[PDB]
RNA sequence: GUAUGUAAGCGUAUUACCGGCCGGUACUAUUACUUU
């Protein structure tokens, strides 16, 4: 992406590497300590090895992605770090003794942990920490990303 | 870059099937042939004959 | 863009001289100045040099046509109409 | 009567008489013919309905030539209505 | 009539072996290349007259052209306004005795 | 259906039930396959294939003989073109008909049914592009289809 | 060289008594040396013995490449094996596996998570296949009874029926042990063209 | 086209009834037909019925008693939360005793008498009186 | 004598342990719907 390169140094609280004073060394170079995504969810591996910064990711981030847990569809990738999901779903109106087919359109935080997100993937997002005004998700799973062809690449 | 590895292993799996179907086709000419050759050597001569 | 929808190249004469005369001209100057099928040539390389002759850019073959167009409409039936009394005349 | 059955058994007559599409169970009227043209001992199993204005082996001799149903065999050619 | 050669010229494109243009022509003309030689309706007067005698010379066979340069070069489906052929290796031709 | 026209009218092909057969047939898959490949070098269609090699030989079924449809047996070896034939043929008639109307301009019926044979086009591509047979987004415009026929 | 046991009969089970026996019988007939190239390669996997009401069938399990092979000869196989092995009809199909689309507590067909072909009707359309060898079921006409029960007819050509028709009965059994529905036969007796 | 090939043949018995006749030829025979059609043999509303395999997508032959009445087809298959199981069976049929309401449950497609007895409800196929 | 609706068997997703069939563990196509 970009080298962390902002105005700011970006660093996560709490982590300085010690050099100097404290028993030495066994390799990977990084106190980067990694999630365990659990209510089964399992880490992708980009979380441990994730030179980026993002604090409001869950992974390298200070954030709990607290409750509801929804699966829906990325209608727009467009934008860094974040995506758009369209989520459609049957609403039984009772009156009219048939539905309506009705949709919501809610703006969910892409960690950049996750790589090939593009509309139209299926994506396990939880409620987040409600993180900048449309944003109130956080990508917890994606589900999808794919390509149920394109994960062997073909000749 | 893609297109070049994944022509790699198609192209090499091709090879392994020929490789199989070689196996299988000089296994085929050889089990009939020797098989073939233990019933007939004396036979053979014998029809021609009569 | 395609700046205006309903001039196009009338649009030199803005607001002088009446809308539907306008309309006329915008037919006739796209006729002129538009390259023709040269039938000695077989390219689209003919172009108005002045009101009624008509010259091909390559093989410089110059051809006598109507003044806004190569081929005017009472042309074509002209030379149709000889060439059919041609016909009969000979055997 | 109007009870009138037997469609399961469908008699013999009735179900030569409609048509290719309205059997049952819908069978091709379209057959299969060994073609034999008598300077060449060579059979080419060709169609009474053709879709081939099919040469013989080498020789561009005819055979046949379609009309919109069935394909006239054309002349002195003898056939057999059977696959072979 | 014609149809013809729309059909024909597209067959010989796929299988076979072209040179376009007065020059390549007049060289496959000249080096008995060409089987056949297709001359524009258009060609400047000239350019008709000699290619039909580079071909009597030659023996080949002039087919003359229904149509524009236009016509010859969309039938090759080449973009360009094409004003001779040279029929070179047609392989699976009845074309190659033809006349229009 | 007929989508274009009012035309009830359907005529289609009655199979022979027997999936196996025929038994006179003395001819090998090999054989049958590889008149498919000589054919399809030679620039045959696969609908022209099938026809023809009925006829001459006798083949059936291309799908009876050999398992795999005359479509498959030439992809597999590789003489496949590039567009399915049935696009192919569509876009023949719809690149010839609009140099058509370019020659003959206010042929009105023309032009109308100009419009059906693109539109059809463009429906039966839009299939296509979902098989991934056809390269998603691929497009049809006039311009480029002219050089695709020939 | 000594064809025998050990070598046609796995790949499924290592005896028994009624494989081996129809094992030797198949060597028997590739003596006869025209009879051999073809014959060879054809493995049986196993064989069951079921029993129509006097007589028991024979019914033999193909892997499946070989069955292609195994049909072009067959009926002079079955007619070799039917004098020779006589009381028993014998009879071929090829060992097919029957997987689900989802049996159970939330959960899985896996393996290969399962093409059009890789199921349930596919075999059962086979099985009927391959038991009748030369005839081919024209018209398969399915009656469901008042009382809740279903019963097939199977609609036999007739064209080389002659090996089959009396196997008619047996094939009944045969599917009613394997497969299960009860099939009852019907012809169209005499050739008639639509 | 036949978006619902349900109705179609169900028509085509009511309609086959109508004349009295006993035998009806139904294009072009789904598995939610066939279900259909072995709930109505239970009941002994119609006589039995044959699916033939062209290899095209099946015809049937029905054999008729005549027995029924009417047979209707529901599309949209509108569902079912089990307490309106009671306001559709008393709207269409025509009494509490008798005539089988017909859903598509999650066990299978059975009648709301079946459906009632499994506790599973459903979206709704059809009506047969 | 039936009837089979109910129970258990047998044919590539009820396979595998541990503790004495039971009960976990290891478990497994997305949904809409529907069930509790």
Redesign the interface.
């Known amino acids: 992406m970009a080298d962390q390169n902002e105005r700011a140094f970006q660093k996560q609280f709490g982590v300085n590497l010690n050099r100097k004073v404290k028993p030495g060394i066994t390799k990977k170079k990084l106190l980067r300590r990694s999630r365990d995504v659990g209510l089964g969810f399992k880490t992708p591996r980009e979380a441990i090895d994730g030179t980026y910064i993002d604090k409001k990711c869950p992974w390298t981030g200070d954030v709990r992605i607290r409750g509801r847990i929804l699966t829906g569809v990325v209608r727009k990738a467009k934008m860094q770090r974040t995506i758009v999901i369209r989520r459609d779903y049957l609403h039984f109106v009772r009156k009219y003794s048939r539905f309506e087919k009705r949709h919501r359109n809610m703006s969910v935080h892409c960690s950049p942990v996750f790589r090939d997100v593009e509309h139209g993937d299926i994506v396990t997002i939880g409620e987040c920490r409600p993180l900048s005004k449309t944003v109130r998700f956080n990508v917890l799973k994606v589900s999808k990303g794919q390509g149920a062809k394109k994960s062997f690449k073909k000749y | 870059m893609?297109?070049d590895?994944?022509?790699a292993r198609?192209q090499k799996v091709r090879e392994a099937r020929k490789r199989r179907e070689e196996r299988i086709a000089t296994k085929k000419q050889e089990l009939?042939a020797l098989?073939?050759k233990?019933?007939?050597i004396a036979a053979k001569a014998a029809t021609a004959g009569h | 863009a395609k700046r205006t929808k309903k001039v196009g190249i009338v649009g030199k004469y803005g607001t002088r001289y009446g809308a539907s005369l306008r309309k006329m001209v915008k037919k006739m100057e796209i006729t002129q100045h538009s390259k023709y099928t040269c039938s000695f040539c077989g390219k689209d390389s003919m172009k108005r040099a002045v009101v009624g002759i008509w010259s091909c850019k390559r093989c410089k073959r110059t051809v006598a046509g109507g003044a806004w167009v190569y081929s005017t409409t009472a042309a074509a039936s002209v030379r149709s109409a000889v060439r059919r009394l041609r016909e009969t005349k000979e055997q | 009567m109007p009870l009138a059955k037997d469609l399961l058994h469908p008699l013999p007559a009735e179900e030569k008489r409609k048509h290719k599409l309205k059997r049952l169970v819908q069978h091709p009227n379209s057959y299969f013919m060994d073609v034999k043209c008598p300077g060449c001992y060579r059979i080419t199993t060709v169609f009474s309905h053709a879709q081939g204005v099919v040469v013989c082996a080498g020789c561009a001799t005819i055979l046949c030539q379609p009309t919109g149903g069935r394909a006239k065999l054309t002349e002195g050619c003898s056939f057999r209505r059977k696959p072979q | 009539a014609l149809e013809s050669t729309n059909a024909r010229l597209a067959l010989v494109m796929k299988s076979g072996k072209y040179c376009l243009g007065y020059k390549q022509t007049l060289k496959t003309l000249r080096q008995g290349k060409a089987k056949l030689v297709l001359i524009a309706s258009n060609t400047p007067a000239l350019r008709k007259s000699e290619i039909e005698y580079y071909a009597m010379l030659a023996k080949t066979e002039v087919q003359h052209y229904s149509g524009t340069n236009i016509e010859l070069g969309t039938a090759c489906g080449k973009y360009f306004r094409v004003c001779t052929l040279s029929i070179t290796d047609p392989g699976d031709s009845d074309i190659i005795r033809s006349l229009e | 259906g007929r989508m274009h026209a009012p035309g009830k009218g359907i005529s289609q092909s009655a199979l022979p039930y027997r999936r196996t057969v025929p038994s006179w047939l003395k001819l090998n898959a090999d054989d049958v396959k590889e008149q498919i490949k000589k054919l399809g070098k030679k620039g045959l269609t696969p609908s022209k294939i099938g026809i023809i090699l009925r006829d001459s030989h006798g083949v059936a079924q291309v799908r009876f003989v050999n398992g795999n449809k005359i479509l498959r047996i030439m992809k597999s070896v590789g003489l496949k073109p590039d567009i399915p034939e049935d696009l192919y043929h569509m876009i023949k008639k719809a690149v010839a008909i609009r140099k058509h109307l370019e020659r003959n301009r206010k042929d009105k019926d023309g032009k109308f049914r100009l419009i059906l044979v693109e539109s059809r086009i463009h429906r039966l591509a839009r299939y296509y592009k979902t098989k991934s047979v056809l390269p998603p987004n691929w497009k049809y415009e006039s311009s480029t289809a002219s050089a695709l026929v020939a | 060289m000594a064809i025998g046991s050990k070598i046609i009969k796995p790949g499924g089970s290592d005896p028994d008594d009624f494989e081996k026996s129809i094992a030797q019988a198949l060597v028997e007939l590739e003596a006869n040396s025209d009879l051999k190239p073809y014959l060879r390669d054809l493995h049986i996997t196993r064989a069951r013995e079921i029993e129509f009401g006097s007589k028991k069938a024979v019914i033999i399990y193909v892997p499946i490449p070989q069955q292609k092979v195994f049909q072009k000869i067959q009926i002079i196989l079955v007619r070799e094996l039917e004098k020779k092995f006589s009381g028993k009809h014998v009879v071929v199909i090829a060992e097919r596996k029957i997987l689900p689309k989802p049996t159970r507590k939330a959960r899985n067909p896996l393996k290969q998570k399962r093409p059009r072909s890789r199921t349930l009707t596919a075999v059962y359309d086979a099985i009927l296949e391959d038991l009748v060898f030369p005839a081919e079921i024209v018209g398969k006409r399915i009656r469901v009874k008042l009382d809740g029960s279903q019963l097939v007819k199977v609609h036999l050509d007739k064209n080389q029926q002659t090996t089959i028709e009396h196997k008619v009965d047996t094939f009944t059994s045969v599917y009613k042990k394997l497969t299960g529905r009860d099939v009852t036969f019907e012809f169209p007796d005499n050739y008639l063209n639509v | 086209v036949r978006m619902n090939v349900l109705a179609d043949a169900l028509k085509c018995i009511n309609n086959a009834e109508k004349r009295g006749k006993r035998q009806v030829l139904l294009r072009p025979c789904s598995k939610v037909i066939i279900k259909f059609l072995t709930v109505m043999m239970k009941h002994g509303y119609i006589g039995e019925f044959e699916i033939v395999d062209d290899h095209r997508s099946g015809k049937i032959v029905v054999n008729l008693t005549g027995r029924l009445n009417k047979c209707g087809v529901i599309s949209p298959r509108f569902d079912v939360p089990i307490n309106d199981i009671e306001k559709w069976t008393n709207n269409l049929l025509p009494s509490r005793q008798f005539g089988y309401v017909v859903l598509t449950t999650s066990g299978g497609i059975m009648d709301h008498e079946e459906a009632r007895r499994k506790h599973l409800g459903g979206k709704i196929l059809g009506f047969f009186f």
Do not use: G
Request: aromatic share 0%; charged share 40%; glycine share 0%.
């Open positions: 893609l297109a590895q994944a022509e198609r009939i098989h073939a233990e019933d007939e």
